[PDB]
Amino acid sequence: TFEEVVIALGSNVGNRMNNFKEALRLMKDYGISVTRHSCLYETEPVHVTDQPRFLNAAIRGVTKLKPHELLNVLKKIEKEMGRPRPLDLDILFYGKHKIISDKLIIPHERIWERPFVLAPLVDLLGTEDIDNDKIVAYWHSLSMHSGGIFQAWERLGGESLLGKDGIIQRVIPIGDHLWDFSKKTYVMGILNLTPSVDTAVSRVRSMISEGVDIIDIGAISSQEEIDRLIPVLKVVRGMAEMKGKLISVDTFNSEVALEAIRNGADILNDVSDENMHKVVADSDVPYMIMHMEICKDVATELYERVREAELSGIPAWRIMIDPGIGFSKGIDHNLDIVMELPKIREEMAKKSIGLSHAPILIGPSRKRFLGDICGRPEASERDAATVACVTAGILKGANIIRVHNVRDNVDAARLCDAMMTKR
Numbered sequence: 001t002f003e004e005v006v007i008a009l010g011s012n013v014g015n016r017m018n019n020f021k022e023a024l025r026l027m028k029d030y031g032i033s034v035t036r037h038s039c040l041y042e043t044e045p046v047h048v049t050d051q052p053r054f055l056n057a058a059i060r061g062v063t064k065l066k067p068h069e070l071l072n073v074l075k076k077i078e079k080e081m082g083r084p085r086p087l088d089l090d091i092l093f094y095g096k097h098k099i100i101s102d103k104l105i106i107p108h109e110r111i112w113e114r115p116f117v118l119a120p121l122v123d124l125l126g127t128e129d130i131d132n133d134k135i136v137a138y139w140h141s142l143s144m145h146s147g148g149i150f151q152a153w154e155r156l157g158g159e160s161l162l163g164k165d166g167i168i169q170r171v172i173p174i175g176d177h178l179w180d181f182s183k184k185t186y187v188m189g190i191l192n193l194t195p196s197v198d199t200a201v202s203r204v205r206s207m208i209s210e211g212v213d214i215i216d217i218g219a220i221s222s223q224e225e226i227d228r229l230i231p232v233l234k235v236v237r238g239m240a241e242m243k244g245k246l247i248s249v250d251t252f253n254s255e256v257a258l259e260a261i262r263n264g265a266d267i268l269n270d271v272s273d274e275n276m277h278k279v280v281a282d283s284d285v286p287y288m289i290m291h292m293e294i295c296k297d298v299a300t301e302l303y304e305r306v307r308e309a310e311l312s313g314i315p316a317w318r319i320m321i322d323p324g325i326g327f328s329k330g331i332d333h334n335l336d337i338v339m340e341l342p343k344i345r346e347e348m349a350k351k352s353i354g355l356s357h358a359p360i361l362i363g364p365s366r367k368r369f370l371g372d373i374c375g376r377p378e379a380s381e382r383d384a385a386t387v388a389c390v391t392a393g394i395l396k397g398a399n400i401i402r403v404h405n406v407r408d409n410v411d412a413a414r415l416c417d418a419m420m421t422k423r
Contacts, residue, residue, distance in 0.1 A: 002062040010088035016055040036060040037315035038120030047350040055118035060124040096138040112152040123354030181359035185413035188214035212412035220249030237264035291324040299347030326367025334369040341396040363402035364389040377402040
């Protein structure tokens, strides 16, 4: 009926991400249902060349098509996009057993010595979830030196391969650029619209001189919200000071999402509408999702929502995570999220290793819990507590911090990044 497959994607030709976007469409139409996307990888060349760097990924899906039928749809997509060849599609795994034909070694022995194949492969697999992931145990056993796919990766260098002096980098695509949200801590400054246009621009100008990276503009009724957001969105986007800076926008209203994307919003931050998945699917914008036994609860809660999002055509490689600090009505839960960020990632890794590597944004800034712990009932008096909390979260792995006081938190990010530099 349906056989589970894993296909690798590779491109260093044209708009590399357009090729991957196109391949994913033609895969759907020609009878391939993609259930899981890997993270995106940008691989350095291991020899001297003037060629562009490769973008490498992998997908996992169900298909009726037989091996030779499937291979021919991939060869078809390859030629059809080609009218040098833009896009490599390779079958990594078909069903449960090794296939051999004239040219069809599935899985080829090369995949256990290619980090740009193995890293994205690993992301499609959970470390536990054996209950619901029956086919994976077989893939593991097709490894040439045993210990599963996971130990093949480890043999190559595992996660040590990504980072400072890395062969290869996990990257998030934002329009025409690739951002490595793991290379340093990115600081997202809050610009709130209910505490006008001229104040907004001077706020932003100040955040930019304070060291900010990303501007979070957040504003309920579908038109009221368009009327407040879109004008300042337009202005902020045009600012000369905002060249090569990102803008996230905070909404749950698909119509605000669509209008914001159209008007220069780089990241869309949902907090929760089935129209939304569709808006974010047509677009090329990163999709940040917020969370609604704490580690396990947050992991699985998040996972369920990412599985939903992948299935509705939103790859995991442009999905970002906020565990939702300071929505929990209590101290102990908020401290856990910050201090147990690596544990949340293990719990995510159990269902999806890819999601375990997704960039994580924390927003502790002047939340009540800092107040209750430090005796700061005035929000504005909670900045020193916020620097401390943000320093903890970065040390426990956070990649983005959502802050009110840009300068003080930037000083903390710059220091955390110097401290965590391996030396």
